[PDB]
């Protein structure tokens, strides 16, 4: 039987908060079967829990967050959420003593190492997958995102960004998902933005933790980071990283084929909600024998 996963032990790391520029301590905890992914703020008293749920996500001008009934938020969950999906972590409590997840290097890779430190523990309860049964498409002008039935998990993503540092040959990326492929191909791909935008935000007291150390920073013409890009198509790899995190907000790995053209956090969430809202488009499946598990979701 394919089992749900949590962590073996509690682990802690400290990083910089993108928004405040202050040190944030992140604690990852094992959790019981079926409890899912829970983000928790422990700066607040009492602490506030935000269960990961497609309906609780909000997108801002800067990042994604989860909100509670009172619109209290926890922010910058996008890249850690992608790492959870990548390693198939079903149940976990994620604490920060601050209003935001640390930005790390702008990618998901530092979170992967932290999760490896915590270890994986298999629980005695079947892991539930969401199987796509019908085609579902959502649109935003000329932008769109789609799920189709497919016995596996594939992503095919065309980026919305247009810049001299992005050739036409580097605007699309497609992959067959797996833990190893996520780690090797996607996890290290950084977020990105304009120097003038970062300077401007910082002049307004925002994004104080923003720097070359946590993003690809471009001007109108070129990548400014002295070491350049980690991949010739790093921008679109990062957008696939984001998509993997967006889709995992339902708390289940999905068996189907994902295709997107100029999508992003908002449209990816719209697709996820559209699927879950249409009863006949999907079903929960479990695997009592490891054989019939799509290759996509094998052990790391």
Instruction: Give the one entry of Zn ion, ligand GVR, none that residue 249 binds, where binding means its C-beta sits below a cut-off of 5 to 8 angstroms depending on kind.
Output: none
Question: According to the binding rule CB under 6 A, does residue 76 interact with ligand GVR?
Answer: yes
Question: According to the binding rule CB under 6 A, does residue 208 interact with ligand GVR?
Answer: no
Residues pairing with 143 in the sheet: 140
Question: According to the binding rule CB under 6 A, does residue 81 interact with ligand GVR?
Answer: no
Question: According to the binding rule CB under 5 A, does residue 91 interact with Zn ion?
Answer: no
143 contacts: CB under 8 Å, gap ≥ 6: 160, 261, 262, 263, 264, 267
DSSP H helices, 53-134, are: 78-87, 109-118
Rounded to whole angstroms, the Cα distance separating 16 from 264 reads 25
Is the CB of 91 or the CB of 191 nearer to Zn ion? 191
Residue choice 76, 107, 171, 191 for contact with Zn ion (CB under 5 A): 191
Number of residues assigned to the chain: 300
Question: According to the binding rule CB under 6 A, does residue 223 interact with ligand GVR?
Answer: no
DSSP letter (8 states) at residue 8: S
Instruction: Give the one entry of Zn ion, ligand GVR, none that residue 207 binds, where binding means its C-beta sits below a cut-off of 5 to 8 angstroms depending on kind.
Output: ligand GVR
Query: Which residues are known to be catalytic?
Result: 265
Question: According to the binding rule CB under 5 A, does residue 242 interact with Zn ion?
Answer: yes
Is the CB of 62 or the CB of 206 nearer to Zn ion? 62
Residues pairing with 37 in the sheet: 92
E strand or H helix at 241, and its extent?
helix 234-247
In degrees and rounded to multiples of 5, residue 147 shows phi and psi of -115, 135
Rounded to whole angstroms, the Cα distance separating 220 from 201 reads 17
Instruction: Give the one entry of Zn ion, ligand GVR, none that residue 1 binds, where binding means its C-beta sits below a cut-off of 5 to 8 angstroms depending on kind.
Output: none
What tokens were used for 183?
């780690």
* Site track for ligand GVR across 1-40, x = CB under 6 A: -----------------x----------------------
Is the CB of 129 or the CB of 157 nearer to Zn ion? 157
Closest CB 274 distance from ligand GVR, rounded Å: 21
Secondary structure (3-state) at 181: helix
What tokens were used for 25?
């301590």
State the number of binding residues for ligand GVR (CB under 6 A).
21
14 contacts: CB under 8 Å, gap ≥ 6: 23, 24, 25, 26, 102
Question: According to the binding rule CB under 6 A, does residue 137 interact with ligand GVR?
Answer: no
221 contacts: CB under 8 Å, gap ≥ 6: 164, 165
Stretch that binds ligand GVR, among 40-48, 132-140, 155-163, 177-185 (CB under 6 A): 177-185
Instruction: Give the one entry of Zn ion, ligand GVR, none that residue 180 binds, where binding means its C-beta sits below a cut-off of 5 to 8 angstroms depending on kind.
Output: ligand GVR
> Which residues contact ligand GVR (rule: CB under 6 A)?
18, 62-63, 76, 78, 103, 106, 116, 180, 183-184, 191, 193, 197-198, 207, 210, 214-215, 242, 300
> Which residues contact Zn ion (rule: CB under 5 A)?
78, 191, 242
């Amino acid at each position: 039987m394919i089992k749900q996963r949590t962590l073996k032990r509690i682990v802690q790391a400290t990083g910089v908060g993108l928004h405040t520029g202050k040190k944030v301590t992140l604690t990852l905890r094992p959790a019981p079967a079926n409890t899912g992914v829970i983000y928790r703020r422990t700066d607040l008293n009492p602490p506030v829990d935000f269960p990961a749920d497609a309906k609780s996500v909000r997108d801002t001008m800067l990042c994604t967050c989860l909100v509670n009934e009172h619109d209290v938020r926890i922010s910058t969950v996008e890249h850690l959420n992608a790492a959870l999906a990548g390693l198939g972590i079903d149940n976990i409590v994620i604490e920060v003593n601050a209003p935001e997840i640390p930005i790390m290097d702008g990618s998901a890779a530092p979170f992967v190492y932290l999760l490896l430190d915590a270890g994986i523990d298999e629980l005695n309860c079947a892991k539930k997958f969401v199987r796509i049964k019908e085609t579902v498409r959502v649109e935003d002008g000329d932008k769109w995102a789609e799920f189709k039935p497919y016995n596996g998990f594939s992503l095919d993503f065309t980026i919305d960004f247009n810049h001299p540092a992005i050739d036409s040959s580097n605007q699309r990326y497609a992959m067959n998902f797996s833990a190893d492929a996520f780690m090797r191909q996607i996890s290290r791909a950084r977020t990105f933005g304009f120097m003038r935008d970062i300077e401007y935000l910082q002049s307004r007291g925002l994004c104080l933790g923003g720097s070359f150390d946590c993003a690809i920073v471009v001007d109108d013409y070129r990548v400014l980071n002295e070491d350049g890009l980690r991949f010739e198509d790093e921008f679109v790899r990062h957008k696939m990283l984001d998509a993997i995190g967006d889709l995992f907000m339902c708390g289940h790995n999905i068996i189907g084929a994902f295709t997107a053209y100029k999508s992003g956090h908002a449209l990816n969430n719209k697709l996820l909600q559209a699927v879950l809202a249409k009863q006949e488009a999907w079903e929960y499946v479990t695997f009592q024998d490891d054989a019939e598990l799509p290759l996509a979701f094998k052990a790391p």
